[PDB]
Amino acid sequence: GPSCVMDDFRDPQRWKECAKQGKMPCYFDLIEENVYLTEMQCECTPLSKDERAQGEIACGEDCLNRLLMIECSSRCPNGDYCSNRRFQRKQHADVEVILTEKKGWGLRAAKDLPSNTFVLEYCGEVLDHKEFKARVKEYARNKNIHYYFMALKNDEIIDATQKGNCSRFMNHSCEPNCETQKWTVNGQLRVGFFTTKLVPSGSELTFDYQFQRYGKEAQKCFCGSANCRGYL
Ligand SMILES: Nc1ncnc2c1ncn2[C@@H]1O[C@H](CSCC[C@H](N)C(=O)O)[C@@H](O)[C@H]1O
Ligand SMILES: [Zn+2]
Ligand SMILES: [Zn+2]
Ligand SMILES: [Zn+2]
């Protein structure tokens, strides 16, 4: 029923009042890039102004950085035209955070989303395996209901329980329309959501959770798909 746009989360005090009434999810620390709890160029021919003006993608699907799921930096041959700097430029798709029937809050497209469209980066606190297991028990002790863990690399798990952005609201489906992709940005790995098919406006954005924390009971899955696994 209730819904809200990405920008409603910039203002903290207005947010806590909307949350106090149930028109926005509960407060968390909004951040722009991953926070660690313990701390070359491509070959694309630069585009001329004509081909720029008439609609040519700079650093298209044949870009060497894009192929290795590396993002270009400042020094790219196309400079400002580079379409391969989506994480750094926060070129996120238009999405809204909405109340679902029983999964809690969720993400839905506010515009049509073509296939293999960048949706959002999944930000949060990065933990090693020791910190991760520490919080799994802190969160079972606090009877948390929603969990916000995302596998990044060996000895790196992303935890958006406390700090993150609106990507933390994407819910599970056994028949998803999104996936995670790991991208290198300045020598460092981040993960983001990408649509795996055309998502029509209004439709809820979902991906297929593949995380193992386990023990503390299992959660039933309300995705409502034809072939639902039954649980998360
Ligand atoms: N398909 C599904 N069925 C039941 N619960 C789901 C679900 N997908 C996501 N969830 C819930 O959402 C949590 C993941 S975090 C996703 C955002 C969450 N819906 C929220 O309001 O904050 C899970 O721990 C689970 O509680
Ligand atoms: Zn390139
Ligand atoms: Zn580039
Ligand atoms: Zn399901």
Curated annotation (Swiss-Prot):
Protein's cellular compartments: Nucleus; Chromosome
Region ranges (Interaction with TUBA1A): 1-232
Family of this protein: Belongs to the class V-like SAM-binding methyltransferase superfamily. Histone-lysine methyltransferase family. SET2 subfamily.
Record-annotated Post-SET domain positions: 217-232
Chain ranges of the SET domain: 93-210
Effect of residue 168 to H/G: Loss of methyltransferase activity. Abolishes ability to monomethylate STAT1
Mutation effect (residue 212 to A): Loss of methyltransferase activity
Shown chain mapped onto the complete sequence: 1446 to 1689 of 2564
Annotated residues for binding of Zn(2+) 2: 59, 72, 76, 82
Transmembrane segments: none
Recorded consequence of changing residue 152 to P: In ALL; uncertain significance; somatic mutation
Disease linkage: Renal cell carcinoma: Renal cell carcinoma is a heterogeneous group of sporadic or hereditary carcinoma derived from cells of the proximal renal tubular epithelium. It is subclassified into clear cell renal carcinoma (non-papillary carcinoma), papillary renal cell carcinoma, chromophobe renal cell carcinoma, collecting duct carcinoma with medullary carcinoma of the kidney, and unclassified renal cell carcinoma. Clear cell renal cell carcinoma is the most common subtype.
Protein name: Histone-lysine N-methyltransferase SETD2
Subunit structure: Specifically interacts with hyperphosphorylated C-terminal domain (CTD) of RNA polymerase II large subunit (POLR2A): binds to CTD heptad repeats doubly phosphorylated on 'Ser-2' and 'Ser-5' of each heptad. Interacts with HTT. Interacts with IWS1. Interacts with p53/TP53; leading to regulate p53/TP53 target genes. Component of a complex with HNRNPL. Interacts with TUBA1A; the interaction is independent on alpha-tubulin acetylation on 'Lys-40'. Interacts with STAT1.
Modification comment: May be automethylated.
Function: Histone methyltransferase that specifically trimethylates 'Lys-36' of histone H3 (H3K36me3) using dimethylated 'Lys-36' (H3K36me2) as substrate. It is capable of trimethylating unmethylated H3K36 (H3K36me0) in vitro. Represents the main enzyme generating H3K36me3, a specific tag for epigenetic transcriptional activation. Plays a role in chromatin structure modulation during elongation by coordinating recruitment of the FACT complex and by interacting with hyperphosphorylated POLR2A. (Microbial infection) Recruited to the promoters of adenovirus 12 E1A gene in case of infection, possibly leading to regulate its expression.
Occurrences of domain AWS (ranges): 40-91
Tissue expression per record: Ubiquitously expressed.
Positions contributing to S-adenosyl-L-methionine binding: 103-105, 146-148, 171-172, 219, 222
Binding-site residues for Zn(2+) 3, renumbered to this chain: 174, 221, 223, 228
Effect of residue 179 to A: Increased methyltransferase activity
Organism superkingdom: Eukaryota
